[PDB]
Amino acid sequence: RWRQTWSGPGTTKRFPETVLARCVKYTEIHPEMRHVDCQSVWDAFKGAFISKHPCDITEEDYQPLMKLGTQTVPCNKILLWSRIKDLAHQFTQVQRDMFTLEDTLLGYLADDLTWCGEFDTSKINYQSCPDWRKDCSNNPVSVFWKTVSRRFAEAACDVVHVMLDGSRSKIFDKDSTFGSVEVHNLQPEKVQTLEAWVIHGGREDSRDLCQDPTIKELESIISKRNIQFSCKNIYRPDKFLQCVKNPEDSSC
Ligand SMILES: NC(=O)c1ccc[n+]([C@@H]2O[C@H](COP(=O)(O)O)[C@@H](O)[C@H]2O)c1
């Protein structure tokens, strides 16, 4: 066929087997998740979107999966990120200094995957799924990330860190998941400070991007929620990661 229903990539090939295998792998590694029944998780994940119109997904659809995937994360060691996931993941891999969303069972299960179903059949759609912009925002994937990111931000306390991509024209983007969901769901009763690490993409010598208009907007928004804001430039992310691996080495 030469034309698809939707404008987005279709469900990831072998989605069911992939989610299942990821759940097995995660529960084998992480002792606190040892008991989780991975069949049950698959079933709940399925139940959220199969036989439903993929432009009519709600957060409620994901509640059974959210329940099954309930997990304590050290509330003071949370790392959020925006449009810079590779560095964020490479960093937490070194010595588990912090935890991203993708370090949780549910973030781990869905990371890099696409999925959707069909109204009034129980089939997974492998040909196309709704594009957030062109088709609808209430699609299974977008609704999943909004739901899980909210819960992750609500769990944070003390100093929460965020890595931002200093090479984008909007270092802080109010339309991103970080800017539209996470920023507004940090609990001012619990969260003392949000500290941003602005990652330079500009090789060598560069500006103080903590002075960027979008960083000042983020400062203003956070400050107005009664949370302190701190910012730091990471001028050479390669050096940073080497310093994490081998601190007090030299030049760090
Ligand atoms: N792994 C993902 O694909 C994914 C998707 C949406 C949101 N998130 C969460 O939101 C942030 C990234 O989303 P944005 O790049 O849209 O800000 C991260 O803080 C993460 O906690 C992760």
Angle at 37 between CA 35 and CA 39, to 5 degrees: 165
13, 35, 81, 233 from 113: Cα distances, Å:
9, 24, 18, 31
Question: Would you say 55 and 134 are in contact if contact means Cβ atoms under 8 Å apart?
Answer: no
Residue with tokens 């003071």: 76
Question: Would you say 168 and 91 are in contact if contact means Cβ atoms under 8 Å apart?
Answer: no
Question: Would you say 153 and 176 are in contact if contact means Cβ atoms under 8 Å apart?
Answer: no
b/e sequence 101-122, b meaning 16+ C-beta within 10 Å: bbbbbbbbbbeeebbbbbeeee
| Ligand 1, pocket-test mutation among 101, 102, 180, most atoms within 8 A of CB | 101
Give the three-class secondary structure for 172.
Answer: coil
Question: Would you say 71 and 41 are in contact if contact means Cβ atoms under 8 Å apart?
Answer: no
The answer on 88 and 66 residing in a single domain is: no
The answer on 121 and 188 residing in a single domain is: no
The answer on 151 and 161 residing in a single domain is: no
Question: Would you say 115 and 52 are in contact if contact means Cβ atoms under 8 Å apart?
Answer: no
4, 15, 198 from 1: Cα distances, Å:
8, 22, 45
Among 135, 155, 175, which residue terminates a domain?
A: 155
The answer on 238 and 225 residing in a single domain is: yes
Mark whether 243 is an active-site residue.
no
CA of 251 to the centre of ligand 1 (A): 32
Measured CA to CA, the distance from residue 185 to residue 180 in angstroms comes to 9
Method for structure elucidation: X-ray
DSSP labels, 95-134: H-SSB-GGGSHHHHHHTT-----BTTB----SS-B--TTT
6, 7, 13, 82, 113 from 127: Cα distances, Å:
8, 10, 10, 28, 14
The answer on 148 and 169 residing in a single domain is: no
Among 155, 184, 199, which residue terminates a domain?
A: 155
Question: Would you say 16 and 102 are in contact if contact means Cβ atoms under 8 Å apart?
Answer: no
The answer on 110 and 24 residing in a single domain is: yes
The answer on 85 and 19 residing in a single domain is: no
The answer on 34 and 1 residing in a single domain is: yes
Residues with CB under 6 A from ligand 1: 80-83, 85, 101-102, 111, 145, 149, 152, 176-178, 182
CB atoms within 10 A of CB 251: 6
Mark whether 75 is an active-site residue.
yes
The answer on 125 and 248 residing in a single domain is: no
Task: Give the residue ranges of DSSP H helices in the chain.
Answer: 15-29, 38-49, 63-68, 85-95, 105-110, 140-154, 177, 183-185, 213-223, 237-245
Measured CA to CA, the distance from residue 131 to residue 120 in angstroms comes to 21
Resolution of this model in Å is 1.8
CB atoms within 10 A of CB 133: 9
| Ligand 1, pocket-test mutation among 83, 145, 176, most atoms within 8 A of CB | 145
The answer on 135 and 202 residing in a single domain is: no
Q: Which of 157, 210, 243, 252 is catalytic?
A: 157
Report how many domains make up the chain. 2
CATH number at residue 128: 1.20.82.10
Q: Nearest C-alpha to atom 13 of ligand 1 is from which residue?
A: 177
Among 140, 155, 170, which residue terminates a domain?
A: 155
CATH number at residue 168: 3.40.50.720
The answer on 192 and 111 residing in a single domain is: no
Closest CA to 116 of 191, 67, 57, 33: 57
> How many CA atoms lie within 13 Å of 39's alpha carbon, on the beta-carbon side?
0
Tokens representing 150 are 């909210």
Residues with Cβ < 8 Å from 185, sequence gap 6 or more? 149, 150, 153, 154
Q: Nearest C-alpha to atom 6 of ligand 1 is from which residue?
A: 145
Domain that holds residue 232: 73-99+156-252
